Each structure stands twice: as C-alpha cells, then as structure tokens.
Design an enzyme around this catalytic site. Structure first.
Site, PDB file in Angstrom:
ATOM      1  N   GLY A 174       0.989  -1.336  -0.336  1.00 51.97           N
ATOM      2  CA  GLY A 174       0.006  -0.184  -0.034  1.00 51.97           C
ATOM      3  C   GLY A 174       0.773   0.879  -0.007  1.00 51.97           C
ATOM      4  O   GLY A 174       2.476   1.316   0.148  1.00 51.97           O
ATOM      5  N   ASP A 227      -9.062  11.274  10.684  1.00 53.62           N
ATOM      6  CA  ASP A 227      -9.137  10.575   9.529  1.00 53.62           C
ATOM      7  C   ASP A 227      -9.791   9.145   9.483  1.00 53.62           C
ATOM      8  O   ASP A 227      -9.234   8.401   8.326  1.00 53.62           O
ATOM      9  CB  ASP A 227      -8.091  10.713   8.845  1.00 53.62           C
ATOM     10  CG  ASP A 227      -7.898  10.314   7.613  1.00 53.62           C
ATOM     11  OD1 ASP A 227      -8.909  11.043   7.042  1.00 53.62           O
ATOM     12  OD2 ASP A 227      -7.112   9.528   6.784  1.00 53.62           O
TER      13      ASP A 227
HETATM   14  C1  LIG Z   1      -1.851  -5.496   5.094  1.00 51.26           C
HETATM   15  C2  LIG Z   1      -1.995  -3.882   6.073  1.00 51.26           C
HETATM   16  N1  LIG Z   1      -1.448  -4.744   7.370  1.00 51.26           N
HETATM   17  C3  LIG Z   1      -1.467  -3.306   7.734  1.00 51.26           C
HETATM   18  C4  LIG Z   1      -1.016  -3.478   9.126  1.00 51.26           C
HETATM   19  C5  LIG Z   1      -1.098  -1.572   9.271  1.00 51.26           C
HETATM   20  C6  LIG Z   1      -0.841  -1.109   8.355  1.00 51.26           C
HETATM   21  C7  LIG Z   1      -0.701   0.509   8.347  1.00 51.26           C
HETATM   22  C8  LIG Z   1      -0.454   1.415   9.128  1.00 51.26           C
HETATM   23  C9  LIG Z   1      -0.649   2.987   9.802  1.00 51.26           C
HETATM   24  N2  LIG Z   1      -0.693   2.952  11.278  1.00 51.26           N
HETATM   25  N3  LIG Z   1      -1.275   3.818   9.131  1.00 51.26           N
HETATM   26  C10 LIG Z   1      -0.959   3.118   7.398  1.00 51.26           C
HETATM   27  N4  LIG Z   1      -0.726   3.928   6.692  1.00 51.26           N
HETATM   28  C11 LIG Z   1      -1.149   1.438   7.611  1.00 51.26           C
HETATM   29  N5  LIG Z   1      -1.250  -1.536   6.947  1.00 51.26           N
HETATM   30  C12 LIG Z   1      -1.362  -2.936   6.718  1.00 51.26           C
HETATM   31  N6  LIG Z   1      -1.406  -3.108   5.789  1.00 51.26           N
HETATM   32  C13 LIG Z   1      -1.692  -2.571   3.715  1.00 51.26           C
HETATM   33  C14 LIG Z   1      -3.067  -1.669   4.012  1.00 51.26           C
HETATM   34  C15 LIG Z   1      -4.216  -2.785   3.577  1.00 51.26           C
HETATM   35  O1  LIG Z   1      -3.736  -0.686   4.760  1.00 51.26           O
HETATM   36  C16 LIG Z   1      -3.269   0.991   4.601  1.00 51.26           C
HETATM   37  C17 LIG Z   1      -3.755   1.400   5.163  1.00 51.26           C
HETATM   38  C18 LIG Z   1      -3.709   3.424   5.020  1.00 51.26           C
HETATM   39  C19 LIG Z   1      -2.766   2.991   3.859  1.00 51.26           C
HETATM   40  C20 LIG Z   1      -2.408   2.202   2.936  1.00 51.26           C
HETATM   41  C21 LIG Z   1      -2.338   0.566   3.524  1.00 51.26           C
END
Ligand SMILES: Cc1nc2ccc(-c3cc(N)nc(N)c3)nc2n1C[C@@H](C)Oc1ccccc1
Ligand SMILES: [Cl-]
Length: 335
Positions: free
Chosen positions: A24, A145
């Site tokens: 992501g 958010d």
């Molecule tokens: C598969 C997976 N496990 C995750 C565990 C944690 C996080 C994550 C933690 C924090 N604090 N901020 C962010 N932006 C992501 N992101 C994960 N993701 C990726 C995707 C699904 O989530 C997303 C969610 C938002 C944006 C991009 C990916």
C-alpha cells in the site's frame, strides 16, 4: 533521490526483513509486506517519506501508538499494534503487525452491494469500543481520518477489525492541521470552522456504517459546498444556535430577516431533510435497493434500531451527539 524510497521485491534489510511486496501507499510514504527472519512472522512496515511534514506526522503517530500501549485493557486491541520503529536508508520505518485488507476492499468484493446488517453490527460494536478506548481521559485522541480505507480486517475470513493511521490525529483541544477528515466523512462542525472534539470521529463512524451496509457513500461531496448540501438533503438545515456561532456559516447558508437560516443558491439538490435515511436504508422496503427482502437478519425491527443509532451518531449538535459508552448500550447491539 526525492521523498519516495527505492523498493525492490526480494531484497533484504539489516539481515532481518525480507521484502515480499508493496502492500500500500498514501501521502505519508508506502507500506511493504516483509518477513521478519528474527521472530519468524510477517510484518507490515510503513515507510515514511524523507520530508519534514511527513516525518513530523509519523513522530506524532509513534507517540500516540506508544501511549496507547501503556494501558492494560482488552479495548486497545482494536488499534493496530506498533511492534517497533527504526531509521534505515534515511527514512523513519514503523513496523506493524500484518493485517488483511481494508473495509473499502471488502465492499469492492461484494460489488458495492454492501455487507449484511449482521456484519455491519459486528464492525459497529468494534468501532464503538475502539472510540470508547480513544476517549479514555489520559488519551483523549481524535483520529481525524476515519474512513473505510483506515479500518482493516485482522484476517480475510473473520469479522475482527482494527483502526490504523494516526498520522493526522491530535489530542482534545489541539488545532494543528488546516483541513482535517476525509471529505465524505467530515463532520459539520469541521465544515463550519467550529471547535472540534472527539464527537467528530462518531460522525465519521455513522457515515462509514451506512456505506458498509448500502455499498455507497451516504454524503459523496465533490467539494465542501457539495458536501454540506448533501448532508442538508438528508438532515435538514442545522440548528440556528450552531449557525449563529459558526465562522464559515455564510459559505453554505444565509440568515433571513426573521432570524431563520436557509441554503445559499449554488453559483440542483432535493429540498432540505427530504432524502430520508429511512428510505436510503430501505427500513420498510427490504433494505438497500430491496436486496435484503425475505433474508434473515434484515427485519423492519432490526432496521429501525440501526436507523435510530445512525441518526444519534449524525446529530448536528456535537454536545448531544451520542458518545461511545451510550452507543454500546443501544438496543441495536442487544444480545
Ligand atoms: C496489509 C496491511 N497490514 C497493515 C498493518 C498496518 C498498516 C498501517 C498502519 C498505519 N499506522 N498506517 C497505515 N497507513 C497503514 N497497514 C497495513 N496493511 C496494508 C493496507 C491494507 O492498509 C493500509 C491502510 C492505509 C494506507 C495504506 C494501507
Ligand atoms: Cl467548496
């Protein structure tokens, strides 16, 4: 060169993390799935861009996630666990537990027809407990958010969810960012330029839950004026006592001679309060688009409690808007 780090699938960092793929991205940087060879588990590493703005947001994210980890309570498990952070190739890196996909992707699987009321109630009950936790006086965290993309399934077949992404969060009383909340989930008090508290996250939750069940955004504004017009179609003109104190009231409304407010002209919307939530949920007409007609778990009674809880979450008045403790006592959740 520039903000965004170089990510090659199959490479390895610090003779530990084995980068399987990119899972992501966002304005903050990127998230990679990597195998942690030391304690033999998959992790998600949030790579922060090497720009001050994002470093600064991430640094708040670290403080707030580390503050939540001090508390002994089962409720903290509705927040993504931060394992550790470190600097590497001149980038702040936040190592998270690996979860599954977000609630938007879950809606996409259903082809935006929505999940069952029974799944909506399980997510609602977890989101309300998560918000109760964030409202612990010692935390008083406003997420600022909440949207389907920042709610993640722990596991692809199970119902358990967690909240991620505290990059734009603050504590009660703080005013840090010019614009806050994703537009579709943005509370009226923020649109109106009024002081905001923990009630803005409950507004967002209400919007999220309707969308999770119907498959589409309740208030899909293309800009702030369109957002406020879309909220007014459903909930009517906000109360005079709010508009009298709102710095940005005249961006959306005009005060008449008699002292009542109505909408500014646009330069086409359903009249104020006529796009009823009772019809958007299809309380008496077999659920959204009639698709849940007959189906078990989708009675008029179940729909009436859902509707009633949602309207308490979408109260214009942030002082009387329902709070997490009281939402968890709603008959919608009665076991
Ligand atoms: C598969 C997976 N496990 C995750 C565990 C944690 C996080 C994550 C933690 C924090 N604090 N901020 C962010 N932006 C992501 N992101 C994960 N993701 C990726 C995707 C699904 O989530 C997303 C969610 C938002 C944006 C991009 C990916
Ligand atoms: Cl606008």
């Amino acid at each position: 060169r520039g903000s965004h780090m170089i990510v090659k699938n199959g490479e390895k960092w610090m003779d530990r993390y084995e980068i399987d793929s990119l899972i992501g991205k966002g304005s903050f940087g990127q998230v990679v799935k990597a195998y942690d060879r030391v304690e033999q588990e998959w992790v998600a590493i949030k790579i922060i861009k090497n720009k001050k703005a994002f470093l600064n947001q991430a640094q708040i994210e670290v403080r707030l996630l580390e503050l939540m980890n001090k508390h002994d309570t089962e409720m903290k498990y509705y927040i993504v666990h931060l394992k550790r952070h470190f600097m590497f190739r001149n980038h702040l890196c936040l190592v998270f537990e690996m979860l599954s996909y977000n609630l938007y992707d879950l809606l996409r699987n259903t082809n935006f027809r929505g999940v069952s009321l029974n799944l909506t109630r399980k997510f609602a009950q977890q989101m309300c407990t998560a918000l109760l936790f964030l409202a612990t006086p010692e935390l008083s965290i406003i997420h600022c958010d909440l949207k389907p993309e920042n709610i993640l399934l722990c596991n692809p077949k199970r119902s358990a969810i967690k909240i991620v992404d505290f990059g734009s969060s603050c504590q009660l009383g703080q005013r840090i960012y010019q614009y806050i909340q994703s537009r579709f989930y943005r509370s009226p008090e923020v649109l109106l330029g009024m002081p905001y508290d923990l009630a803005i996250d409950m507004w967002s939750l209400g919007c999220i839950l309707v969308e999770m069940h119907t498959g589409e955004p309740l208030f899909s504004g293309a800009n702030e004026v369109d957002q406020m017009n879309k909220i007014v179609e459903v909930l009517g003109i906000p109360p005079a006592h709010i508009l009298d104190q709102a710095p940005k009231a005249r961006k959306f409304f005009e005060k008449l001679p008699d002292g009542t407010w109505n909408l500014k002209k646009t330069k086409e919307y359903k009249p104020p309060g006529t796009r009823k939530l009772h019809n958007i949920l299809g309380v008496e007409t077999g659920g959204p688009g009639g698709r849940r007609a007959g189906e078990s778990g989708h009675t008029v009674a179940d729909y009436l409690k859902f509707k009633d809880l949602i309207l308490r979450m979408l109260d214009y008045d942030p002082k009387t808007r329902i709070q997490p403790y009281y939402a968890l006592q709603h008959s919608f959740f009665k076991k």
